[PDB]
């Protein structure tokens, strides 16, 4: 039963005060309050919206040591200078009020306090403007809550596309569908993990069901397997086939997304909490939102048909590049940012791959090595990286089994858009019925 304590607290004792009944530490309801705070805090700091790490963990089960079942965590103690109360209602239902907030107002539910609690342990700058709770944000609370949730999901979408389930197609990508020998242009709208040594290898190759939307049509196609999908660059599009022109238009665009503030080195450390039964390192949810620099940094970028991320692997032009680096197979992306000349730059290490027919590799490449006769080497000193403009990024690098054949169909990416939906066009996106159908299609099979 891991016990959580707050390092610091903004609580003020002199905010303490239709009757109110103090609930001390020993009270069974104070305990329940602190048990809910601890569980949900733990699931937030070591999880957050969109996490699929428990799925990978339970698949792998076949410094400080800690259990990964966050339902057991609990607050050892309320943050200093906070006081809990029971208030009688005429509605009747009891309410549990927590005083201490500098504004002098109570948190009238454990759910409202949680957002402030999460800010107390996450915001290392103790900046009151980054909290989503009702008492710091008032009317902006829903907007801030929603953005935070979106950002948490973006982080886990990034982690899954580059660490957890990287050998896969990505949300919003334009692909080729192959059904009954028909090449259908489509866009990935949604995807879900399939509920289940060789278990881990099959999941790494086919982790997802894909649910697509034909481009130039109103047709939905649910429950697609990667074996029936090919990257857009595998086959050519037809100039005279009128319905192909929606896919042609989208695959000429690009848009940055997921702006964030890089973290300073003093706010980072080596993994401190691990799984007590398996020594798996816990995933710590970063809170990038802050204040800074003339460089804007971004989680990722749509390049025509493909989605690209930080921590991802991409192909780059080797033409203008010293003789020492022309064996470069891909860049391992470290950072994506707009410099002060307004140019999108990719920073990362350069590698070569050798098909024969792991400490220092990312998990994605460690798995490619176990599952193929392919070996990876960095072409340069471990302490430097290289920077090329977006102009010299050619596309995604795919695992060696991902594509029988080659990708020679480059497209002219020359139009910036504000959004993927803006480039797709709302008339070419899905309607709300899609998600009604989807739910029925995956109701039993999908992971939870």
């Amino acid at each position: 039963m891991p016990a959580i304590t707050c390092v610091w607290s903004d609580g003020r004792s002199d905010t303490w005060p239709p009757s109110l009944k103090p609930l001390p530490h020993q009270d069974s309801k104070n305990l329940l309050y602190r048990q809910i705070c601890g569980r949900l805090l733990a699931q937030h700091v070591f999880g957050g919206a969109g996490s699929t790490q428990p799925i990978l963990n339970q698949l792998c089960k076949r410094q400080i040591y800690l259990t990964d079942s966050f339902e057991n965590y609990y607050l050892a103690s309320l943050p200093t200078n906070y006081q809990l109360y029971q208030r009688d209602s005429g509605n009747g239902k009891r309410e549990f009020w927590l005083y201490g907030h500098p504004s002098g107002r109570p948190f009238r539910s454990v759910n409202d306090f949680l957002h402030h609690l999460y800010w107390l342990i996450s915001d290392l700058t103790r900046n009151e403007s980054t909290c989503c709770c009702v008492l710091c944000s008032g009317n902006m609370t829903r907007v801030r809550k929603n953005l935070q949730k979106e950002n948490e999901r973006m982080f886990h979408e990034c982690k899954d596309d580059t660490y957890t389930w990287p050998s896969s197609y990505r949300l919003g990508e334009v692909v080729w569908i192959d059904i009954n020998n028909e090449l259908i242009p489509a866009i990935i709208v949604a995807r879900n993990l399939i509920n289940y040594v060789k278990l881990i290898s099959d999941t790494f190759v086919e982790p997802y069901q894909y649910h697509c939307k034909q481009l130039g049509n109103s047709r939905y196609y649910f429950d697609m397997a990667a074996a029936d999908i090919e990257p857009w660059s595998r086959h050519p599009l037809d100039l005279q086939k009128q319905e192909h022109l929606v896919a042609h238009s989208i695959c000429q665009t690009w848009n940055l997304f997921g702006i964030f503030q890089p973290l300073e080195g003093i706010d980072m450390e080596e993994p401190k909490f691990h799984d007590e039964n398996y020594s798996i390192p816990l995933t710590v949810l970063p809170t990038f939102g802050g204040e800074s620099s003339l460089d804007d940094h971004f989680y990722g970028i749509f390049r025509g048909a493909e989605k690209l991320w930080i921590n991802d692997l991409c192909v780059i032009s080797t033409s203008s590049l010293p003789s020492v680096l022309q064996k470069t197979s891909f860049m391992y992306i470290s950072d994506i940012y707009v410099n002060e000349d307004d140019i999108v730059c990719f920073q990362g290490s350069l590698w070569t791959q050798i098909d024969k027919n792991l400490k220092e590799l990312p998990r994605r490449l460690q798995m490619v090595s176990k599952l193929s006769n392919t070996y990876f080497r960095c072409l340069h000193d471990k302490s430097v990286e290289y920077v090329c403009p977006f102009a010299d990024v050619l596309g995604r690098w795919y695992e060696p089994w991902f594509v029988k054949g080659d990708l020679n169909y480059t497209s002219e990416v020359k139009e910036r858009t504000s959004s993927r939906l803006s480039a797709v066009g709302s008339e070419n996106w899905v309607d709300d019925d899609f998600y009604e159908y989807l739910l029925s299609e995956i109701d039993m099979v999908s992971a939870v």
């Binding site: 879900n192 450390e269 909490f273 990722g300 730059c345 302490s383 403009p389 102009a391 010299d392 910036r416």
Partner: protein, 66 residues
């Protein structure tokens, strides 16, 4: 009312109507650059953003756990 229950059920499946890059972040000046330019080395001084995604490095927290 029935739409809220479907969405809630899809969320248990990690399925959402929204994902990174779909909608405008606000609700711009970046440009592509020059092809065939020079590709220059720089210093890997502090942990880059990519490593927080990998998990090799984590952000500090104001939390003590026993």
């Amino acid at each position: 009312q029935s739409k809220d229950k479907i969405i809630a059920a899809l969320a248990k499946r990690n399925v959402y109507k929204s994902f990174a890059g779909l909608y405008d972040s606000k609700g711009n000046y970046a440009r592509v650059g020059r092809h065939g330019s020079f590709i220059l080395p720089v210093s890997k001084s502090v942990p880059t953003p990519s490593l927080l995604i990998e998990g090799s490095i984590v952000q500090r927290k104001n939390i003590k756990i026993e």
